[PDB]
């Protein structure tokens, strides 16, 4: 990694946590400069404005989601048993899913649907549909093992998505109430997996 | 209805225009005065503030939207044949939910969630878990029947409901709606049914 490469990490990180902490309006370019520890001049140079920043925010927790995602499903593909090996994943992506920086993120990506369209359109893209194509190549790959069977593997990847995470993800962006013990978060993705396997069981 | 009661509603009824045409922010109770047909001093008078008369709109919209919903539900607890009783259910489910000022609505209500923590917890109990018990109370009796089998009916309702929504709403809360045909959409809605059915038909 080059100097330029750890700066622009850097800053970016800054701006994710400026961002959530005080939202779009209340933070700027040289606050951010200031707490990446980078000139206002790098940060100009770099980024331009604090729009297209904002953008780049967007695509960098996009990544970071989908590569954590890529291992879990790796992981899935590991298994002996899809039951287990189901519930495994289900729990890590409710984990990884319901991360209240990441949630607060989404708030304000929503917030901006019509100031900043490109926003939302970016996490569309890179957040939300390479985390079902990534499960649907894995589950495309479970089907041809004969392990599963999901014709539409994509549409089968949105079903346990959404069983999983329509009530939580919901409750968080209606509520902010972003709470549930171990043992909540557990049933909740069993039940979940159990009800998949109905339909995609062997 | 009285004077007052006429005036109340069509105070809200001009607000939840003003709100979903320039947003919160955007929006002025002079806007939704002229709007409404009504003095400023009459729109405090009645509702005190801005976030108030929000608060109203949010629970008009989620008692107008949920009693379109109790009507399909109700009239699925009465039907004979399953696949087609719960397609309608699903495709009317998903008319609803994607028209295009109700997911503006929605959209405001995630947007301010996290500052009106009471607006967003009315929109989530009287109109997210609202259409969750509507649909419940109709498994429930149709499990009563021996025509489906959903041992856990808020549950089983969750699960249409993530199946049917997962891509639809957040391709809207992030990208402005989905821009899919009635066509797609409808059979989107058909492919949530066979799922559905594959885990809780009998
Ligand atoms: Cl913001
Ligand atoms: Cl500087
Ligand atoms: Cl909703």
């Known amino acids: 990694e080059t100097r330029s490469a750890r700066k622009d990490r850097e800053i970016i990180q800054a701006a994710t946590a400026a961002f959530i902490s005080k939202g779009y309006d209340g933070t700027s370019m040289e606050e951010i400069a200031t707490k990446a520890g980078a000139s206002k001049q790098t940060v100009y140079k770099h980024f331009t404005d604090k729009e297209t920043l904002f953008g780049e925010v ?5 990544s970071q989601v989908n590569d954590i995602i890529e291992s879990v499903t790796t ?3 590991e298994a002996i048993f899809m039951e287990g090996g ?3 994943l289900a729990r890590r992506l409710i984990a990884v899913l319901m991360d209240e920086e990441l949630l607060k993120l989404r708030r304000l990506i929503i917030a901006n649907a019509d ?3 490109q926003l939302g359109r970016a996490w569309y893209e890179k957040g939300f549909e390479r985390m079902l194509a990534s499960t649907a190549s894995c589950f495309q790959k479970l089907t041809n093992r004969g392990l599963i069977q999901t014709g539409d593997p994509y549409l089968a990847a949105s079903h346990l998505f959404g069983m999983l995470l329509w009530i939580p993800m919901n409750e968080a962006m209606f509520t902010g109430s972003n709470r549930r013990s171990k043992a909540e978060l557990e049933r909740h993705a069993d039940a979940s997996v159990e009800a998949f396997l109905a339909v995609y069981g062997v």
Chains 1, 2 share one sequence.
């Open 58 to 62: 967007v695509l960098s927790t996009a």
């Open 75 to 77: 992981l899935l593909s």
């Open 115 to 117: 100031r900043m369209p």
């Open 86 to 88: 189901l519930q495994q």
